[PDB]
Amino acid sequence: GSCKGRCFELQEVGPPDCRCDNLCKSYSSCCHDFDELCLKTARGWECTKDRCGEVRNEENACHCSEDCLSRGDCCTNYQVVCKGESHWVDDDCEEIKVPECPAGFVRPPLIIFSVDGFRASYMKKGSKVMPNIEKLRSCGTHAPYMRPVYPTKTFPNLYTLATGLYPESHGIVGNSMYDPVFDASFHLRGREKFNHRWWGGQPLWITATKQGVRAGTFFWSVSIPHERRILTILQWLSLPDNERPSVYAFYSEQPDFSGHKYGPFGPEMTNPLREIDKTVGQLMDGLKQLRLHRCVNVIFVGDHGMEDVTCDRTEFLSNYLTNVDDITLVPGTLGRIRAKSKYDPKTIIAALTCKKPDQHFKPYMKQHLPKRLHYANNRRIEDIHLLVDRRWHVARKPLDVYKKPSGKCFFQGDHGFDNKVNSMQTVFVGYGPTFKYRTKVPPFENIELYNVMCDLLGLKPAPNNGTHGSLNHLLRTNTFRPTMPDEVSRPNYPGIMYLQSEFDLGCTCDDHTKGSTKERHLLYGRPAVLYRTSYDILYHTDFESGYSEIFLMPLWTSYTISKQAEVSSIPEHLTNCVRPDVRVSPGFSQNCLAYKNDKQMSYGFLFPPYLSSSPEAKYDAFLVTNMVPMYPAFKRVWAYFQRVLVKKYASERNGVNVISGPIFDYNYDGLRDTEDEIKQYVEGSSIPVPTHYYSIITSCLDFTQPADKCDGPLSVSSFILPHRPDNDESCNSSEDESKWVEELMKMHTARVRDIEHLTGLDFYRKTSRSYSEILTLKTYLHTYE
C-alpha cells in the first residue's frame, strides 16, 4: 500500500493494488502516501547558495546536500550553484561529432520535449525571453516551422506525432468524437479516452517496446508540476542498464493554456514562454550534471499553433437553418454535423452554402474536402463538415454558447483550423549527437516525425504516412537509406498500327518517334507505374503521355512551357474536333457518342490546344488519346488554368514543366482506386469518370535558369482539383473566372506525394539530384500563406 521505493514506477501495478505511476492521479488510484513522497514541493526546484552542503531534510523537493548525487535527487542546478559549474545555456555551441555516453549505453537516449500550442512565431521572441530554447535552436537542427495535421487540435496532433499517421488512419479524428460501431463518445474529460479501443496505429512507445527498447511513460497527470516531470525523466536516466529506458517524453499544457486566455500575442504570454524555457534549462542543466548532455538527442516540438479568436466572432447555424434542434454539432474552429436520431444532408449543405456575403465557414461533404487534409476515411468523421475561417467559431445556436456573467469571453485564442493557416504552425528543434550542427532545414509536416524518432532509436517504423528518407537531411547519421521503387508495369511504345477507316468513334474533325520530345517534355524521366496495368507511351511535338488502355485515357500528360511561350486559340474550325489515334486500337479508345448520350458530361484535353507550338502541332491536341471526361462546370476551371494560368506560371517561373492527369478516389481513402472501385462512367460506356484532376508544375528553384536547363534543386507546386458538376464550392463562381478559379486551386494545393498515393505513379525518377532530396521535394506543400 506504499509508494515508498516506487515513485513514477515504470511497471504500473494492476487493479486493485494502489499505484505510484505517472497517471495514478488521473485514475484516482495513487497509494495514500503518493503526494507525500512523490510530489514533494518544499523549497522549490532550485538550489540556493545557503542550501549548498545543507543537512538533508527529506521533505524537500530536491536536494543540495553532499549525498544528493548518491541519492539521485540533487536539484538540476546543484553543480552550478554549489560546485562552480556553468549553466548549459552559458556554454557556447559545441559540435557533438559522436555520442559521448556512459558504458552500458547501447544507443543515445531520445527525449521529446513537447509543448502544447507553441506557435512557430514564438521563436522570434528571442534569447532574452527564452535563452535555453534559442540555444537548442541555433546550436542544433531546426525548421522555420512544422505543419500540424487537421484538425489542429491536441489529441489528433499528439497521436500523429506518436504514430506518423493521419488522424483518419490513427482514429483520433478530434478531441471529441462519436463512433457508431462502439456507440460511444470520446471526450477530453472523463476516463473513456484511456480505453485502448480508440487508439489505432502503433505509437512510438509501443514500437520501442515491441523491438526490445524500453520507453518511459510519455503521459503525465496535470497535477504533477513540470519541474517534477523533468526530475523524474532525469532520475529514470540513472536507472541500471537493464532498466533504463531509451525513449522519454515531457509534455506541457503551456503555452496553450495561456494562449487561449490571452490570445497568442497577448503580452501575458511572455511569462509562460519564460517558464517553459526555465523548464528546458532544468532539463539541460540536469543532463549536464549527469554528463549526458553530449549523449542524449532532444526534440523540442509543439502540437499546433494558436490564433486570435473571440466569442463575438461566432457564426450560428440557427441563422441559416430552421429546426436546428434536429442536429448535433461538434462546434468551434471546425464543424461536424450529424442527425440526433427533419434531418436531410442535401438540404443542410444547400442551406449552408454561399448564403451570406461575409460567411465565415464553408460546408462540405467530407469526400469533397481538399485531399491535402486527408480527413474523410474514418467512420468517426461525420459526412457533413464545416471548414471555419481563421479567427472564427461556428456554433449551433446562441444559447448553446455562454460568455462569463461579466459579459467577457472565456477565451481570446483558439486553434483547430485548416493546417495550412499560418497561425496553426508549430515548432521543431532537434539537438544532440544524431542531429546536424547549426543547421536550418525546410519546414515539414509532423507526420514525418515518427520515422525520424524511429531512426534515432534504431527502430523499424510501423507502416505510416511519413515518407521515410524525406528528412534524412536532418541527421548526421542515417539508419535508413531510401531506395526508389521498381516499376511494375512497362509501357508499350506503339507506332502507326491502324488506319483512319478502322475507326468508328462517332467523332468529327476538319482535317511520332521519340526524338527530342522526351528530352524537352519529360524533364525528370518518365513516371513509373507502380501497379499492374497496360499503358502506352505516346509522343508528340508538344507533349508526351502515358495512355491507359484500361481507363481509356492518360495516366499522365507531360509538357514544358517556356517563359516566352505564346498562347493561341482553339481555331473555330477545330472547336469540336476529336481525332482517332492511329497508334491505339479503336477498342481501347474513347468515343464521342458516349458524350452525346451523356447529358451531364462533356470532355476536355490534358495537353492544352492553347499552348501548341504551331498550327500543325495543334492537331495532336485533339487526339482522342488526349481527352478526358469533364463536367461543363469543371471545364470553366480547367480552361482557365490551361489558357491563362499555365502561361502566367511559365512567365513567373522562367518556364514550367506540367504533368496533369486524372485521379479516381470514389472511396475517399486517398489511394488510387481499382477499376472495381469506380462508381461512375460516361453513360453507356466504360469510360470511367475521374473524381479529381491533378497537375504538377515544376521549375528551377534558381529562377535565373529556365525550367528545361536547371542544374540545381527544383521548385514545385501541385494541385488536386475536385471534378465537380457545379461550382457551388466557389461563392464568386457566377463572376468571371479571374475572380475565383485560382483561389479554388490554392485551396486544393497538394504534395506530389499525395498525387503519387492517388495515382500509383512515381515521379522525378531521373534527375541530377539525390533521391533523399527528391523525397523532400515530393513532400513539399505550397501553401500561399
Ligand SMILES: *[C@@H]1O[C@H](CO)[C@@H](O[C@@H]2O[C@H](CO)[C@@H](O[C@@H]3O[C@H](CO)[C@@H](O)[C@H](O)[C@@H]3O)[C@H](O)[C@H]2NC(C)=O)[C@H](O)[C@H]1NC(C)=O
Ligand atoms: C497512411 O498510412 C496507413 C498505414 O500504412 C495506410 O493504411 C493502410 O493502407 C493499406 C493499403 O490500403 C491497408 O492494407 C491493405 O488493405 C487492402 C484493402 O483491403 C488489402 O487488400 C491488403 O492486403 C492490405 O491489408 C492497411 O490496412 C492500412 N493500415 C491502416 C493502419 O489502416 C493509409 O493508406 C495511408 N494513407 C495515405 C493517404 O497514404
Ligand SMILES: CN(c1nc(-c2ccc(F)cc2)cs1)c1c(CCC#N)nc2ccc(C3CCN(S(C)(=O)=O)CC3)nn12
Ligand atoms: C496522446 N497523448 C500524449 N502524447 C504525448 C506525446 C509526446 C511526445 C510525442 F512526440 C508524441 C506524443 C504525450 S501524452 C496523451 C495525452 C496528453 C498529453 C499528456 N500527458 N494524455 C493522454 C492520456 C492517455 C493517453 C493514452 C493514449 C493511448 N495509449 S496506447 C493504448 O496507445 O498505449 C495509452 C495512453 N495518451 N494521452
Ligand SMILES: [Ca+2]
Ligand atoms: Ca481510393
Ligand SMILES: [Zn+2]
Ligand atoms: Zn494542443
Ligand SMILES: [Zn+2]
Ligand atoms: Zn488549446
